Design a binder for these strands. Structure first.
Ligand code: NA
Length: 198
DNA sequence: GCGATGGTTAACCATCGCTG
DNA sequence: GCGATGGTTAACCATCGCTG
């Protein structure tokens, strides 16, 4: 189906958009071993975007600093999602552009934890954070992460502990969900979450 | 109608840790 | 000693996608 693996409520964009690839993770299985994906960050002249890619045929195309043109991709609350429905081509020279330094900078920065806490519940969070505590449990792995001004609990709920993380490492989070309500805000894993040592 | 997804509340029980 | 903190499970409420 054209919407296979795409997030609920995502909007199809048929028009081509050219982006420069900044980063991409290795592929990994999710949905209890049934599907694969990888995370990426790309930039246009005006914005950077987090990207979730479900078509493994594209892994070779998501190369650092290369320009690619994407169409029939989806937009899920600002996160670009790309499945087999999309077309991805190498960009024509006359479609390339310079990505402003401030965009590159933004795409690499991590929001302050105190600022993260002010966002709406359900907001997807990405970033690199110092680790204060780590606890491996039967059904979860939890962390206390911190920056210079604040700390927050991270809950990894996926039944799987094969995380490439070593003691002393900073923790890199992809697509965690801010949770709040009555009590302390936390970052909780979701179907697409990925965690690794920096 | 059901599966996937997912935020909130809360019960329950264990462990932690040490004066606002 | 004992209140605070933390893990697990579940109920509840909700939306979407597919139901050609
Ligand atoms: Na996939």
């Amino acid at each position: 189906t054209p919407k296979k693996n795409i997030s609920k409520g995502a909007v199809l964009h048929e028009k081509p958009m050219t982006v420069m690839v900044l980063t991409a993770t290795e592929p990994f299985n999710y949905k209890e071993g049934k599907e694969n994906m990888f995370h990426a960050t790309v930039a246009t002249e005006s914005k950077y975007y987090r990207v979730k890619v479900f078509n493994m045929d594209l892994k070779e195309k998501f190369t650092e600093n290369q320009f690619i043109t994407i169409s029939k991709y989806f937009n899920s609350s600002g996160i670009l999602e790309i499945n087999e429905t999309a077309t991805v081509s190498e960009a024509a020279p006359n479609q390339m552009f310079e990505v402003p330094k401030n965009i590159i900078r933004s795409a690499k920065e991590t929001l302050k934890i105190s600022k993260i806490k002010e966002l709406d519940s359900g907001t997807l969070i990405y970033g690199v954070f110092a680790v204060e505590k780590k606890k491996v449990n039967d059904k979860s792995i939890t962390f206390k992460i911190k920056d210079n001004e604040d700390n927050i609990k991270v809950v990894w709920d996926k039944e799987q502990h094969n995380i490439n993380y070593e003691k002393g490492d900073k923790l890199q989070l992809f697509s965690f969900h801010l949770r709040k309500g009555n009590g302390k805000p936390i970052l909780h894993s979701g179907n697409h979450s990925f965690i690794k040592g920096e």
